[PDB]
Design a binder for this molecule. Sequence first.
Ligand SMILES: NC(=O)c1ccc[n+]([C@@H]2O[C@H](COP(=O)([O-])OP(=O)(O)OC[C@H]3O[C@@H](n4cnc5c(N)ncnc54)[C@H](O)[C@@H]3O)[C@@H](O)[C@H]2O)c1
Ligand SMILES: NC(=O)c1ccc[n+]([C@@H]2O[C@H](COP(=O)([O-])OP(=O)(O)OC[C@H]3O[C@@H](n4cnc5c(N)ncnc54)[C@H](O)[C@@H]3O)[C@@H](O)[C@H]2O)c1
Ligand SMILES: NC(=O)c1ccc[n+]([C@@H]2O[C@H](COP(=O)([O-])OP(=O)(O)OC[C@H]3O[C@@H](n4cnc5c(N)ncnc54)[C@H](O)[C@@H]3O)[C@@H](O)[C@H]2O)c1
Lengths: 213, 213, 213
Amino acid sequence: MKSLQALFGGTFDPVHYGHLKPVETLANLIGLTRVTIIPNNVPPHRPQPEANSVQRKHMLELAIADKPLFTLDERELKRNAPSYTAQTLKEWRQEQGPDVPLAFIIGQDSLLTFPTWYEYETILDNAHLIVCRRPGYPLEMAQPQYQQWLEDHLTHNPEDLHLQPAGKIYLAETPWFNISATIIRERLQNGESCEDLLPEPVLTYINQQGLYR
Amino acid sequence: MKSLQALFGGTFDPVHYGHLKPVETLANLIGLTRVTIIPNNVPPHRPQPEANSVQRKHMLELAIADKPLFTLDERELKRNAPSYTAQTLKEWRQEQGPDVPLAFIIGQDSLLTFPTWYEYETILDNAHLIVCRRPGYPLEMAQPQYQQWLEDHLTHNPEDLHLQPAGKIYLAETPWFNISATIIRERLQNGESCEDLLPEPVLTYINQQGLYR
Amino acid sequence: MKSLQALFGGTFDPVHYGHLKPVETLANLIGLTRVTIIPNNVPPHRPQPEANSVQRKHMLELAIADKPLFTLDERELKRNAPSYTAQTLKEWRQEQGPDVPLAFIIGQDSLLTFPTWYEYETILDNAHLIVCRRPGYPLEMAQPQYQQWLEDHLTHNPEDLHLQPAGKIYLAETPWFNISATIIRERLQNGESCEDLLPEPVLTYINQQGLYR
Ligand SMILES: NC(=O)c1ccc[n+]([C@@H]2O[C@H](COP(=O)([O-])OP(=O)(O)OC[C@H]3O[C@@H](n4cnc5c(N)ncnc54)[C@H](O)[C@@H]3O)[C@@H](O)[C@H]2O)c1
Ligand SMILES: NC(=O)c1ccc[n+]([C@@H]2O[C@H](COP(=O)([O-])OP(=O)(O)OC[C@H]3O[C@@H](n4cnc5c(N)ncnc54)[C@H](O)[C@@H]3O)[C@@H](O)[C@H]2O)c1
Ligand SMILES: NC(=O)c1ccc[n+]([C@@H]2O[C@H](COP(=O)([O-])OP(=O)(O)OC[C@H]3O[C@@H](n4cnc5c(N)ncnc54)[C@H](O)[C@@H]3O)[C@@H](O)[C@H]2O)c1
């Protein structure tokens, strides 16, 4: 078993503390020396992002400039066809080999929607799922069958993440943040301060570019 | 519910690691993007501080120059008259509004003396109380009537701090530090090293100013 | 009880993230303002290091240059006679006084071998033992008698480390890392990347010196 690697996907419109901080602590809780962020272009499961692809990428770079834990993989931004996490993870698995523990990080709100993802069942064959807590979201799946799926792959010992290359779901004890890209976009539109919600470099870039206005 | 905001009050004569480190970790444990420190100007529950308001402010700015989590609120500092936490928190609630979760952070030794504070019962109407562990101090209130008050407001699920505006007392699992401003002043008096107890820039300022000797 | 101090010993051939990250997080979990790394030369319990004394020391200074938590103690590299942790801790105890809690940090793999150390029984008379988790290792001593010794000194309350000068063994809940110096040396020799396994500065020095590869 090689060193546990982690990937974190998202649209990040814009990237903010609710995306970053839970993950940074995750690295100290379970042991990650590197987290690859995988931004996407126009995900099917959601409306068009306000900031375009180039701007969202730049904001991510600005945000991790002084945080070596993070790096970017632009495969989904450059992909000509739409991307699917099941596909990106299949690829990562082939590239890294069968002995590299691999984990895909999501927030509690995305775990609730996981069973609706493209070929979701294949994801656990290629990687682990590490879920970060989000305040106020239900902890159990909406439907009984998907709750069973969850319990079927659930582990309470994060050590398991380092001992197998994939297959486990772990609900990490990460910090809570009542922060969303939506609230930030609206605060900016309303002329309310976002100073304590996302990196200064990102905020500054947002204002320089006139984004979300 | 907006983002949980935290306040950290004290005299800081001088600010040292026992003040800062528990709060820095607290931010990563429960989710704080900003902690506003509120230094007072000669409080009623203790004698005059040796360093004056200008010096303690300076030492705090030196201690947090590198720590973006922190910012200062000099409302009690620049005020010559006596200040009371209950009044400060009442003002904070009025200013921030009813939907902002607000927490006032204190150490275990301060929790034990909490029932003697000016109109202490109004504090939980305006904010939550986050208590940082301190080695050696009792965990239970001296008098049963106050242990009951503690028990009636306690929560073991820090997520509560993010879902209600105020009212809970949470005993956080923060790092322990056998450090106090008194030990620091006394060691300086005996010409014993205080390296490892507070920031070097703070110690430098102290010697430059001739403070505590 | 004065402030709890910690010592971290090892060969570090080379120092990597598996050595540092568990310890850095340890400082935030239990409360440590400083950890003194004690590198050794050619200890008898293991073969001769590939990298030499000055090289391993230089790699340590490079790795901690920007991590103020750490400092180096060169006594075991400068000592003429062979070094023994029991002796180094006896000296520390003598130098620090009887009221400083002292802790020596090791990984689970070393704890398993602890009963074979030179005068191992005297170590707990002089300091506490703090153990960092390591994935895949047995949690219990191989022989019942040493497991007895383990259980007899074991505490599940880390506050104990700050209230007594020595005597307890605490198994800290630190991050896991599938990293070893042996795998690094192999990889470098086979020309494979070691980018996410140890500090960039240390990798650079390794290349400059022609080490391992
Ligand atoms: N292949 C598919 O069918 C499919 C369907 C849906 C989503 N996805 C993937 O899931 C990933 C996340 O998509 P998204 O739309 O949620 O991205 P997003 O940009 O909204 O959020 C990024 C991540 O941060 C988490 N997060 C956001 N705010 C948080 C907060 N305040 N606290 C804690 N965590 C928080 C989200 O749950 C998500 O995992 C992407 O990689 C996306 O491609 C794939
Ligand atoms: N309004 C009132 O009647 C009243 C009465 C007492 C205190 N207070 C307020 O309570 C706050 C704390 O005052 P103080 O005199 O104790 O301030 P202080 O400067 O001594 O300490 C600041 C904070 O650090 C905590 N702390 C100190 N050393 C610590 C350590 N080693 N580990 C963990 N925590 C540690 C203290 O308990 C306190 O909450 C101030 O805002 C003060 O005004 C108000
Ligand atoms: N005095 C004696 O008789 C005696 C006998 C054996 C060892 N020792 C001492 O024990 C200390 C450790 O020696 P070593 O040979 O194991 O040093 P090392 O350089 O191999 O490792 C340094 C420390 O890091 C820990 N570690 C390494 N990889 C880790 C990982 N991936 N995750 C978590 N922890 C990890 C090790 O267990 C050890 O405590 C040294 O101070 C050595 O002198 C003393």
